[PDB]
Design a protein around this ligand. Sequence first.
Ligand code: FES
Ligand code: MG
Lengths: 26, 215, 225, 14, 135, 49, 100, 44
Amino acid sequence: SNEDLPISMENPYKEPLKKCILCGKH
Amino acid sequence: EDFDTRILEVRNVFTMTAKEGRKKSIRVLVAVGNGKGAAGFSIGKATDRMDAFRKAKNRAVHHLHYIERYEDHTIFHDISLRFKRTHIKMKKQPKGYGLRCHRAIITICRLIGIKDMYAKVSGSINMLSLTQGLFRGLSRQETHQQLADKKGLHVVEIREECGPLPIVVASPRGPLRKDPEPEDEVPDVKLDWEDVKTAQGMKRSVWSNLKRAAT
Amino acid sequence: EDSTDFNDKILNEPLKHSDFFNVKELFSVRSLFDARVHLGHKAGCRHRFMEPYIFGSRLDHDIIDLEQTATHLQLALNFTAHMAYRKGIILFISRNRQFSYLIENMARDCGEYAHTRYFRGGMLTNARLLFGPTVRLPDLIIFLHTLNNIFEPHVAVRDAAKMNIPTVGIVDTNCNPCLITYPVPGNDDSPLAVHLYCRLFQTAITRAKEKRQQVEALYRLQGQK
Amino acid sequence: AFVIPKKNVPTSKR
Amino acid sequence: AGSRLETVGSIFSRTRDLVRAGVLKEKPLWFDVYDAFPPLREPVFQRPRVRYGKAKAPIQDIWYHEDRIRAKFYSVYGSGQRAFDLFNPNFKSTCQRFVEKYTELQKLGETDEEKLFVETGKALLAEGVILRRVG
Amino acid sequence: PRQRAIQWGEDGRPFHYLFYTGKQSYYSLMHDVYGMLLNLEKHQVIGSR
Amino acid sequence: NVESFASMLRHSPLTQMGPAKDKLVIGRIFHIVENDLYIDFGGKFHCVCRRPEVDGEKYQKGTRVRLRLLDLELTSRFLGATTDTTVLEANAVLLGIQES
Amino acid sequence: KVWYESPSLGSHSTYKPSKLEFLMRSTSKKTRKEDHARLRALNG
Ligand code: FES
Ligand SMILES: [Mg+2]
């Protein structure tokens, strides 16, 4: 049809979620 | 001059006031119509009953509904609706049936120009809810032409007095579909136990089908 | 005898042509795109009745489909030109004060009317009392902004429908077009969009008024001889 | 036609 | 004689019906224009309803293939110290220049992603572009 | 008392483009004063009350 | 061979910019109220920035400036609200003047 | 919302507490119940 139409995908500019100072530490 | 006005309710309303105690005002409900499909209603409020009559009737002609009538004597199809707690069930009827309806519906129907209809009012019998519930249901009735246009098929009327003769009442203005309407062996339509109880003869009431004056 | 020919040659002839005033030459999807008409509000502000007219959301900012705007704008300009041709009263309404001065001048220039000020209760539904029993109301109301300054629909939208007055309206993505007769999905905030709208309506109205005089004059010269 | 007392605004009018 | 029931149909349907019933003696000036050139949708009042449960708006997020390249470029090299000029309709940013070169090299048959990104940076440096890695 | 003149002709069209504000004379003055303030920017007591 | 809207949108600078947070853009002062500068930068909404303390007199109508964008439209949904509240302005930080 | 009402119709209106607004404010206007809440919150 048309090449310039939007395409479905996941947000490429999405930022990671916040993490606490102790995230990932025992 | 073409419009007639009918009163539907005259109420004495009592307002408690800070300094003057209980005061008496009048709330009036009136309906207007020209007998050719154009009808409306308005509430009137005033300290005097005749000032309320003026307000309601003059206001009603600026809020007119147009009501579609089948052959200028009845409604196009059965109408069953609820407005708040007031239920109104209306049935399309043939000529000569007359207006066998709640007295207020009779009054409103003469203003609209409906000659033949059955109506049953159940639940709260509130005049205002009944009036605006009735006008809401009569203003949302689909005519035969609207049905033909929506489905792109002929609307064919079968009358027992005319035997098997098919009478086309409405044809679509646009193209005519070639695929028949699907014939569901059994329709999933909701039925009224009152209608079924009557059709079977199990509905016995000493008050139904009583002889009354021409309406 | 002579009236039927008048109404047929002057009033009924324009209604037999798809674009009698050639309003399609006034704008293009590119001209609209340069004026930022496609820019809508954030997705959180979207009205659900504006969803048909939205192309999508670019990073939570709604984009108005200018292909639809172009078709709606064609109809709105066409209607506006015909009403100006028929010598109808056109009233411009907007409460956005950034553009009050611009809109008031555009109305005066095209020979029409503007209401950019606080809208008092009953200007339309109680006009005979406010103006007089012989007051003539507008035949067309054009809303350049359909919302008031508390982000609610302008009261004149509801009251114009009550008085059976057709409405042309620019409807952004947070607006309600249900009661607007000829809605035009488009950006109502950017000065470039609003200025474009004023040029198009001003030109359409001015062109239709000049066309009415040309036809009338020709119809008279030919009538004598 | 029923004669609700007819109204006259012009009386007190300027 | 007329109707102010703005929530019952449209101004056209209310006007057309009252003209037939003889309530309105003359048609309004706009009626013939509406009839010849009607709107796409008949303006009928509707009450906007709120979505519940599994109902969601049909609007879709607008994305392009190059957006993946833009996200990586901003992460690796950050936003260019050059300022966007959104007034110029033909403005090209450093990221757009990166994306165009990235697209050119992909069409030359290269298919790896990590390799197609490193060769693009070298090409621009050869052309004199300043690419300061953020980290 | 001075009488306000007709605000429309035989065709019913109001003379002033701000008629439907109901305050055409007042809002026309605000429009004229607001317009003067704009042009200045583009360009740039005891005895009276 | 008429360009489509999808093509205009794909190749627009605003589309190519991506997210607006922490993006340097060039704005133009179009209206000034005391020490409040109204700056258009190519978006839907203008931003309002206070006149900088240093070289305040250099900022005049028409002066082009450098901005660091934060939000294209300041909107937030508050408890018990069906929609979002918008102030109808962008959020940006005025860095200085752009010169050639 | 909570038992404390927050459905204000003009909820989006921009709160503008300035000395100049008081002089252009209508003293005829009667303060809303929630108008105090905006003042009370600012004081906090
Ligand atoms: S954010 Fe706390 S464990 Fe991940
Ligand atoms: Mg807007």
